[PDB]
Each structure stands twice: as C-alpha cells, then as structure tokens.
C-alpha cells in the first residue's frame, strides 16, 4: 500500500484499499501511507485513502501528511487535506506558510509570485478576526538569512 501510494499507479492502491487493507499502516519512519501519496503529488490516491479514511497522524519527524504535502510544494493535496473538516486554524496558517516557503526555494517548483501570494493569504487569514489576533512567534534573527525577522505584519510583507 505504501509503495503503491508513492508510485503513480492509482489502480493498484485503489484495488488494495478496496480489498480491505490497513488504512493506518505505520512504517519504520512513521509515514502512515499518506505521506508517500502526499510526497509525489498524487491527488487521486490521497482522495482514495481519504475515502477509505486513512486518518491523519504525526509521523516520526514531527510532521503531518499535510506538512509533507506542503514541503513537497504540492498544493492540490494540501488543499484536499485542508478540506478534511478536522484541521483547526493553526494548522491551516502553518500549512499555507510552509507551502509558500517550499515554493520559495525548490528545483522543480520555483515561482516567487506563488510564494508572495501564498504568504499574503496566510497573513490575511491569520489577521482575519481582528480581535484575538494570532501574532506570529518569531525565532530570533539568524545571521545566515541576512538579518530579517520574518513579516509579522501584512504591510511589511
């Protein structure tokens, strides 16, 4: 199931899940058969597993399958995992921010306009309620990335 989710053969994994396989199949690295699908951007396989209710659990590296999907720049699976109706807000802000970050620097996916627009959407969604403002906790500035201190405001973004 895990390799079939990683590979593009959606027929094989759909047949395996239709044959009453294990949806919560833990791996040695903690990837529960959703990260393999949500690493190669296979939207249909993720759709099939969500239909079979594969469930979302943090892997060994402290990452959700949504986190891996955001890391691999694959936006469509990020959307599908956000539409799972059990996600809360903080996961949505961090997932959109991670998607913008991954789009900022990658080999296959490099579109800086996507990074700016996704970070803008993350900031606007973050500053949506007006009151109860979800201010970003910021690590102290690191000399490697210049000396910037993120963008705590939409104006500086």
């Amino acid at each position: 199931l895990m390799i079939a989710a990683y590979k593009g053969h959606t027929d094989v994994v759909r047949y395996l899940l239709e044959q009453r396989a294990d949806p919560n199949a833990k791996a040695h690295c903690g990837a529960t058969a959703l990260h393999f699908a949500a690493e190669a951007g296979h939207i249909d396989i993720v759709k099939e597993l969500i239909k079979w209710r594969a469930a979302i659990v943090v892997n060994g590296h402290g990452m959700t399958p949504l986190k891996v999907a955001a890391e691999s720049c694959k936006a469509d699976v990020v959307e599908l995992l956000l539409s799972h109706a059990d996600c809360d807000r903080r996961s949505r802000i961090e997932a959109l921010e991670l998607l913008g970050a991954s789009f900022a620097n990658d080999r296959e996916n490099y579109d800086i306009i996507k990074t700016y627009h996704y970070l803008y959407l993350a900031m606007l969604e973050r500053f949506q309620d007006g009151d109860n403002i979800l201010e970003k906790e910021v690590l102290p500035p690191i000399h490697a990335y210049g000396n910037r201190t993120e963008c705590r405001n939409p104006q500086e973004l």
């Binding site: 390799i3 990683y6 791996a27 040695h28 690295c29 690493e39 990658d106 080999r107």
Partner: peptide, 21 residues
C-alpha cells in the same frame, strides 16, 4: 555539473522507496 544540488531526491529517498523499499 555546476552547483545544483542533487539532494531533492535525497530528501525523498529517506522514505523506503526501491524495488523492495
């Protein structure tokens, strides 16, 4: 050659992906 890092596959080879995994 250049400086382009061939590590984008290495970030994805940590999952058990092979003929056997």
């Amino acid at each position: 050659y250049t400086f382009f890092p061939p590590k984008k596959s290495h970030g994805s080879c940590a999952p058990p992906v092979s003929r056997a995994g």
